[PDB]
Design a protein around this ligand. Structure first.
Ligand code: HEM
Ligand code: HEM
Ligand code: HEM
Ligand code: HEM
Lengths: 143, 146, 143, 146
């Protein structure tokens, strides 16, 4: 669904506060996705290790949050902004889009865990909407 | 359904230290704000006009505590969750007409609230065990819908 | 996700073929939704009868498919076109939007059952994308 | 999971009369077309570039039949479905790395194809029993993922 100007301002403000820890958030959220929802491990079987805190998890965590960083930059047109990443997911990795909601949830949990004061219900609703829009933008090129 | 000893220990430990009057209201208010269709069921609970009103609503707060204590029977009877929630399932189905998808959504809100409360203590293992617990409870609550 | 030119023309062509039986498709789809996915019954407890072929189900099936007919009319801008319907679901009935996917599936099953020759995999992808777009348009005003 | 005599009869009836060489390829081809990420597993199967290529692909057709016969063990063992699928669950998890969400999606495509085939015989009762059956099978196939 459409992000309001409030949603966008809220996400931009939250990102301002959390971006310094973006690598950690990525690594923790990705590690949690893999352990808590082991169905998602099916896309990562080529990795030597999938355990929390492992090299591949840390490295990929930073890449994923780099995509989230890109999304915040392109928040006014996520469809266009995330086109390349949609093409990669649709045609190279071919990730079932149902999984994007799982990662979204794990990112919210990690944000709440690391920034409890910042993560108010109001921040939560805008971030949840934002991640839902990111997931939709990633799904654009699939079909 | 098959619990390890670590999983049982993790769940007991969460509920052993839980401040129900803190966590319960927070989880329910957050649910009502982030997923506002859940407000459907609380028309007799007074003012829910803005997120501030919801956060300040005493009747919602009291219900948050009641719901959270609703998880107690599961913690004390971890091997018999389906039977323990049988009556609560028909209540939500036949009397309250609560859409059971909302149980899942509340569970996610509770996870976020517990994570914020526990911080570093909400380890990956802790989240694994709590998600498993929630999944079983939410399934049990949906069982008697017909 | 966005509808291509192909999707729009495929949906309009299928609608042209099946619109004559819209009321029947609606009644059957709703009847099936309620029986097959009894969680959905929670929004209809005020009805005297929810059984397949019952009066309430027939009458509501009619309304639902008129909403679908409206979406076909406004296929180039579903956000704006379904705005009022979104407001009613958001604030009057307060239907958890997860249920929209359930009804969509039941519509697809009924269209397959009733129009097996017309409902090719090619029409299926486009209609599935369309109903996903309708679901998203209906969810627009919730939060 | 409990079955009525009627649900057992409906399920046995569908499969007893099934043309596997017709239904199997149709369900799988439809899945690859409507939900194209499922193509990820079939990179050795030849041309899947277009709907026409998929519909005409003999290797995809043969696999559709195999998958559909994969359901026979559940029909024969309705009270022991989890155990019937333990080995196939391990296969799909550990060898094939198939995302189990795809099992759900294939079930929905199979439902559509069976409805198209049966017409008026695809009653509400039949769809209830078939959905319950698919839900149990899909759950069983996901059990050994870890
Ligand atoms: C929803 C938010 C997501 C974002 C922003 C995101 C972003 C990214 C980025 C930036 C890359 C690297 C692309 C490159 O190499 O240039 C990537 C790769 C990848 N992503 Fe996503 N991703 C997301 C969700 C997911 C999910 C949920 C899954 C699977 C469950 C997934 C599976 C993968 C895989 C398998 C790779 C390739 C990694 C490798 O081969 O080592 N992504 N993603
Ligand atoms: C998923 C975890 C949940 C649990 C463990 C739970 C448990 C309970 C319990 C123990 C009661 C009290 C019943 C009695 O006193 O007889 C109750 C009542 C109720 N619950 Fe649930 N509940 C849950 C989720 C929800 C959700 C998500 C909603 C709606 C969004 C909801 C709406 C209600 C309502 C409207 C009542 C009746 C309150 C009244 O007396 O007016 N519950 N629940
Ligand atoms: C394709 C998706 C859907 C469309 C196009 C649609 C359309 C409509 C329309 C046009 C109305 C009548 C509006 C009015 O007269 O004011 C309506 C009412 C309603 N809808 Fe939706 N609907 C959809 C999905 C759903 C779903 C999935 C549910 C619940 C599971 C639902 C629950 C209701 C309810 C409870 C009413 C009021 C009915 C009554 O009280 O008689 N709708 N819908
Ligand atoms: C109702 C759901 C399903 C059932 C009952 C089923 C059953 C089977 C069976 C019986 C086999 C052969 C195992 C053997 O040779 O011992 C198999 C293999 C396979 N399945 Fe599944 N399957 C299902 C869903 C899926 C889905 C959705 C996909 C992918 C989208 C998939 C991908 C595969 C692949 C790639 C193979 C190996 C084929 C090869 O070796 O070339 N299956 N499945």
């Amino acid at each position: 669904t459409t992000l309001s100007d409030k949603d966008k301002s809220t996400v931009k403000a939250l990102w301002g506060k959390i971006s310094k820890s973006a690598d950690a958030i990525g690594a923790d959220a990705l590690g949690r996705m893999l352990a808590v929802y082991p169905q998602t491990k099916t896309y990562f079987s080529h990795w030597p290790d999938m355990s929390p805190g492992s090299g591949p998890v840390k490295a990929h965590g930073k890449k994923v949050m780099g995509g989230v960083a890109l999304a915040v930059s392109k928040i006014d047109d996520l469809t266009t902004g995330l086109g390349d990443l949609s093409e990669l997911h649709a045609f190279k990795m071919r990730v079932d889009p149902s999984n994007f909601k799982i990662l979204s949830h794990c990112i919210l949990v990690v944000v709440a865990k690391m920034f409890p004061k910042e993560f108010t219900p109001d921040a939560h609703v805008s971030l949840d909407k934002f991640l839902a829009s990111v997931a939709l933008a990633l799904a654009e090129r699939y079909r | 359904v098959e619990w390890t000893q670590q999983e049982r220990s993790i769940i007991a430990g969460i509920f052993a230290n839980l401040n129900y009057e803190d966590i319960g209201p927070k989880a329910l208010a957050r649910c009502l704000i982030v997923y506002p269709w859940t407000q459907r069921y609380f028309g007799a609970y007074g003012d829910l006009s803005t997120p501030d009103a919801i956060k300040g609503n005493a009747k919602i707060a009291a219900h948050g505590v009641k719901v959270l204590h609703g998880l107690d029977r599961a913690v004390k009877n971890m091997d018999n969750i389906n039977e323990a929630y049988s009556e609560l399932s028909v209540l939500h189905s036949d009397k309250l007409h609560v859409d059971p998808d909302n149980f899942r959504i509340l569970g996610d809100c509770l996870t976020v609230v517990i994570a914020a409360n526990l911080g570093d203590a909400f380890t990956v293992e802790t989240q694994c065990a709590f998600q498993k617990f929630l999944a079983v409870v939410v399934f049990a609550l949906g069982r008697k819908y017909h």
